[PDB]
């Protein structure tokens, strides 16, 4: 996420151990994203379009579970 | 239910606690089948805990379990 | 006061505790759009 948001990243600028392995992983991820439309790199979404897994919209599935728990207890 | 009905002020703090501890008490009380759909819908790490380790057989339908692991 | 005071509440959950009440609440909140 930091590399994505910086936007001033350079591959050869990086120094330290694990440099080559992470470089290879990033190159493979970019190649996979180019070839396959599926997204691997993290992406940011505004507060308007809250998606399925977020904490804001747990309550729907949770209330479904709550209703089934009530059903079982009433049975 | 009270928090989501707006009867008293709604605070995310301790609401995360309510959610997580409800899941905890549900899994302790052996409500695995109910938690299956919740894990599938939200995405979690207890999907392995309940779906395979206590629900569906491992020898069958191996591929989804392998992908999850 | 911070330790010992709890926000007030109203007893409107008597009907919602029933499973049918939860179905009604789920339908209303899902279709709130």
């Amino acid at each position: 996420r930091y590399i994505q948001l910086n936007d001033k990243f350079q591959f050869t600028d990086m120094r330290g151990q694990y440099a080559q392995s992470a470089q290879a992983w990033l190159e493979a991820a970019h190649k996979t994203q180019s070839t396959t439309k599926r997204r691997i790199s993290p992406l940011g979404v505004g507060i308007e379009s809250i998606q399925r897994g977020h904490r804001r919209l747990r309550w729907g599935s949770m209330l479904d579970a709550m209703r089934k728990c009530m059903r079982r207890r009433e049975n | 239910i009270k928090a989501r009905s707006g009867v008293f002020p709604f605070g995310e703090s301790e609401y995360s606690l309510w959610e997580d501890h409800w899941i905890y008490c549900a899994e302790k009380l052996q409500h695995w089948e109910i938690l299956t759909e919740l894990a599938k819908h939200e995405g979690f790490t207890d999907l392995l805990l309940e779906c395979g380790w206590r629900g569906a057989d491992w020898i069958a339908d191996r591929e989804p379990l392998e992908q999850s692991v | 006061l911070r330790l010992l005071d709890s926000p007030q509440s109203t007893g409107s959950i008597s009907q919602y505790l029933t499973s049918q009440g939860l179905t009604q609440l789920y339908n209303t909140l899902m279709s709130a759009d």
Partner: peptide, 12 residues
């Protein structure tokens, strides 16, 4: 707009 509506609630 998302599938699930997002509505503001009062806080502490």
């Amino acid at each position: 707009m998302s599938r699930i509506p997002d509505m503001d609630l009062i806080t502490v």
